[PDB]
Input
Amino acid sequence: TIQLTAQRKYLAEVQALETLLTRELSVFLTEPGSKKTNIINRITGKTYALPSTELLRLYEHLEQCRKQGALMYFLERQGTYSGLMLDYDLKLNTNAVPPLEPPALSRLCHRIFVHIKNSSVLIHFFFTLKPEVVQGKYGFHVLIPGLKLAASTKKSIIGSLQHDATVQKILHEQGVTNPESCLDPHSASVPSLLYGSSKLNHKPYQLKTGFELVFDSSDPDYLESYNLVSELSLTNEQGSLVRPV
Amino acid sequence: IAKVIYAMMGNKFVVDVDSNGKYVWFEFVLPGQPMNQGEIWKWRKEVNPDELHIYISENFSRVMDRITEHIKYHLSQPHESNILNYYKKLLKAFERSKSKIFNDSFKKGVIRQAEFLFRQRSFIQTLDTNPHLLGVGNG
DNA sequence: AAAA
DNA sequence: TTTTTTTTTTTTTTTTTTTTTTTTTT
Output
C-alpha cells in the first residue's frame, strides 16, 4: 500500500525488476488455467512461464531486492518435478522459540531422510521458517530442491510424513502441540513461494541454516557464495549450490 | 495535448456553433455510463464536457507514465556521456510539466483549444431533419 | 546562496 | 375595451492574464 509506493520510487532495485518484467517477462504471459506457467506473481495475480535464462535473470534480481528490503508476492507453482517443498504451519501451544539445534535438526534430517528411502532414489536442507511474532508461532519449511520427484510418489511421501510418529516426538521435543497437520496433504502439489517473497499481510520468511548432507546409492545412510532464491527454488536444475538429484 | 485528446476520443464528441454564436458540446451516449433514462445511442447536449474533463486527468496519466518509463528505459541503456545530460534535462522538464494536466486553468485552456479540432460543420441544422427516424428509449 |  | 404584456431588463465575465516560476547564472 503506502509502503509499496515508497520502494517503487525511493530505491531502484525494484525499479530494475520493473524494467525486466515490462520488456522480457512481458512476452511470456501464460494462461492461469494451464500448468505450464512456472512463475505466479501475486502482486497482480499474473502467471508467467519463464525459460532458464528468463528464470535465472528473475532469480538473480530477487536476492538483491531482499538485501535492500521491499515487499514482493512472487510465487512458483509446484510442478511435476521439484524438491521436498513440504510446508509445516506448526501451530505451537505458545510462541516459545524452539531452537533449531543440530542435534534436534539431525533428528528431523534423518527422519525425513528415512521417508525418502522407500521411494525413487539414485541433499540440501534449506530450513526456511516464519519470522514468528504471531499467534500459532512459526511455520517450519524444510526444502530439498535438488531431487526431482514431484508426483504421486510424493503423495505417498506426504502420507508417510503425515502418518509418521517419529517426527511427532521430535516436534514434541520442541514444545509443539501440533506435531502433525502442519504438513498439508497437498504440500507437494500446491504452488510454493520463492524464498524472500512477502506473504499476504505477513513478512517474508527467513532461512535459519542452509546446510546439506550426502546420499550414496550403495550406502544410503550418510553461505553468501550462491544466489539464495534460485538455490532454494525447484526449477533451477542448473543451480550452483544444488544439483539435480 | 488537445490534439492527442482529439485523436484519442474523436468518435464520441462533436462541437458546433448555435444561432446565438456560442460553441456547444454534444456527447454520444453509450451503455454502461450514468445517464438520464431513454437517451441511449443518441447524441446528448452538454453545456460543459464533464466526461472529457475527467478523462483528461484520469486516462491521460497512463500515457504520461508510459512516457516516463520509456525515458527511464533509455536512461538505463548505456550509450555515451551525452545521454546522462540529455536524458536528464528532458526527464526533469518532463516531471516538471507532468503535474500541469491536473491544474484547472490548464484543463480549461486545453478544452478551449480542442473546441476547434472537434468542430464539425453542418451539424446543428442537420439535427432531426429527416422524418423517417424516431428517437426511442432503446435506440 | 542570492538575485533575476 | 383591453390592457398589457411585452419589451425591457438585465444577463449574458471570466478566464485567462496576472501572479509565480524553479532554475540559472552570478
Summary: DSSP finds seven helices and nine strands in chain A.
